[PDB]
């Protein structure tokens, strides 16, 4: 996370770390418990080829990466049929726990939006994460849990910030209706953050709007961080993610 | 260039290494001299982001990397508009040259192939390049050009492979029409080719199929070489490069 | 430490990890509390070159390394005056505190030895350490506190051992009397581990025997670890170090 | 070699390149010709830890590193039996061609100093070599043999530099007699010259005064290179190395 600071120790009780048997379990990427036993992520962090679930393992809700470690297999991973690049949008995907966790203060679930919601800009969002604090910056040990509160920006208005200064003719649309942008130059979501939340309190309620994406660098100037659409995405989720 | 053997001193006259200025004007990417002041290259290799014309040079053939320069400034930079992402279709790119180059025997251009030809498997094709020699095996000094055979291979049967392994559904098409694919898991292009030619003898003539574009790692089983295929471009080169 | 255990929560109570001012304070090597207002590590970690004491800083003894960090600042730094080189010998320092520590189970001194004992082989030995577990490897978060048990070595022996596929004449001594001997091909300490303690319990007493000082790589054939003798530099230790 | 310029195609005919079996036999260490079946270097080039005569192969002088190899192989190394290490001394061995050379105008030997022979404070020397440019900056390809003029600094005032900023003792003798300085802060050796030579012109003739050997760093401010004293060791040399 760039900007920002350490969350509170009780202020994301959803988010979680994604880690693979490397010589120790070392967190890859971040996602959210919507439900119990499912965990919501980004696909860029376990596709689009085939990951074997050994190498994979999750980790609740922790204040400081590493020294409270109790990792929780995974059953089944679930990517999105139409992902392949994050560039291309589709880049989400559900992890299903081998056993549903025992929600808490500390650790329970974030509410989805409803089909209707569209995050406009001026609402109060945070991104949250374990991810580099700048560029090739990495998070120094404590690892401590970072928080952000990011400016939501029109997609239109972000698809043309990513034309300045490229190539690419205008008629091309590189940030999709899927994808939802979000931040400034010195507030953004950064490497090792992908698959985290993008939350927005809207009317008393944290729901997650997004999930964190691509982007070309972090926190850089027409560049904002893309997020995938959650709302976008609504149905496929609740294919496998029952209604409580 | 994964498998292959280093080139005859004159073995590929149109190849060309586009150098960027570092603390030296270290190459990463190839070309092939298609018209005395033109070189056709891929876009990935300087796009989608504008990039300073002092800060590029292009350097024609020669046998050794570094012995020999005698570097040449670029007028102008094309890059196709489509272009945003090699995944996505649109990776070439054209330079002009501020001066026109005296051909020979050792350098002079080549052939573009007609609108008609689809290069399908069975032809001799070669890719040319200073290229990594195996995944994140760099060339070793004094960094010879390497050339290798490769075999090319249909769209649907290379998307087909693609799709093994891969969560990415079927209906979702990841070697689009304007691509082309060749190689195998002992030979094929690797890092540092992009931009390079991939030319076939098509009736006793060399011709230049596609452009060194992407792929997933290098000799990978299953992951063919993915090139841009010139043919589809064509008008377009054309619409900046005058016949003859 | 190669090869050993995560060390008890209770063990090592005079154990002290110094630290850099980086992007954080971070760890680069143990460290023995033996008064307390003194600490005792390798002339290596500060030396020969000067270093300012505003980047220095000492942690007393933690299980993990940087989850409770209560960062205490250094007073003053006495290197020893024939070093410049751990091979050339008289590899050791003394780091005087800004002000004394509270004393308890946790954290206390460690008792050095007289000048008369010399720790012959057979000594039940233990080097204890936050360092790499291999050549190359280094500890994997939470950053445990390990620790291993090592023989001694006779230094006559030790001599041999560092000639066996060495150009060194027999004549010529490698390990000098200021050194000790300890470890083998599957137990020893390593980088990181420089500046820590060598304890063995004689006669129902935990004596400090060395100072982590050189060796020829962790855990090689041939090649075991190299202590500073403390014995050699008690009187040396003394002008300083108030006795009780 | 921090500091000067890439050598004529004809200035130092006893330069010589040592190389490794690597994925290419890479240049490790320079060393020189001083009889058409010797070659000098620092013994830490090639000890104290025994090495396979298999995978070393001496190049002789090119002006370019990699370009036109013409790999020699060795008889037999001989390392001075007193070298462990550079700090401590005697860095000094021979390699033994199996073969002698057909030595001409531009790949001879050099003349060794007379026992007599001091080389005075400002003698006119030089040395060369294909080692870095400056700390951590490696001699970009097409790696041209680089020269640089060195002032001679007096062993007594480059041992009181030594001292400067350093805690060792001004008891304590640093730059041994066996040594010999040179250079500044903006002309002198480097990582990777270890072995070449220093030439003095004294009285028309060049004469190898030193070998690259030691020092903290390059261009450093009170740290002049460290080089082998060739007067010095001499006799031994003359053990082996029959007199024309
Ligand atoms: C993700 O962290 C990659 C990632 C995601 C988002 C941004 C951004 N600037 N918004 C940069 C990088 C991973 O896969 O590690
Ligand atoms: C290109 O060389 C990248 C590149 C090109 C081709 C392949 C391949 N497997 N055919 C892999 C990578 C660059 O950007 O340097
Ligand atoms: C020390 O840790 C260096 C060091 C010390 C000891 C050994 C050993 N094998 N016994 C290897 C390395 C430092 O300077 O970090
Ligand atoms: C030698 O190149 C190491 C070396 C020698 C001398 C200096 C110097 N500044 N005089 C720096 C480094 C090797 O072992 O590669």
Known sequence: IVGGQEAPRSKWPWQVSLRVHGPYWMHFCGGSLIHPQWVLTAAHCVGPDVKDLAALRVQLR????????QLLPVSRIIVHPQFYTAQIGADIALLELEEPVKVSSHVHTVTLPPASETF???MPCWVTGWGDVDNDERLPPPFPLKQV????????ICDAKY????????????????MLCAGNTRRDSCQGDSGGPLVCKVNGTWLQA????????????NRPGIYTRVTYYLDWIHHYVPKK
Not at 62 to 69: A, I, K, R, S
Not at 149 to 156: D, G, Q
């Open 210 to 221: 997004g999930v964190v994406s691509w982007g070309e660098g972090c926190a850089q100037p």
């Open 149 to 156: 509160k990011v400016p939501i920006m029109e997609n239109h």
């Open 163 to 178: 034309h300045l200064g490229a190539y690419t003719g205008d008629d091309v649309r590189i940030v999709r209706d899927d």
């Open 120 to 122: 406009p800009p001026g």
């Open 62 to 69: 922790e204040q400081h990466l590493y020294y409270q470690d």
